[PDB]
Amino acid sequence: TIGFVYELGHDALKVHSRQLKSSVVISYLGNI
């Protein structure tokens, strides 16, 4: 059963084969 857990945990059958946080935030500071 542990070897089957290894099979499932690593997904050698590609269980997850098929599959809007933005890295940019902008801040306004105003006039110099």
Next chain:
Amino acid sequence: FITSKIWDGALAENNHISSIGNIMYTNYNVWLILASFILLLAMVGAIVITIKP
């Protein structure tokens, strides 16, 4: 080749699968454990060398 019957030996015959089952988990279960670890090595090994991690 000559063959005859026995009666005390034929009280409750086991099929060959039964006779194997009577000893392979009890008297010789070290072999079964050894085989299990060999099967476990094969599954982990064959997987590790073939599939993209």
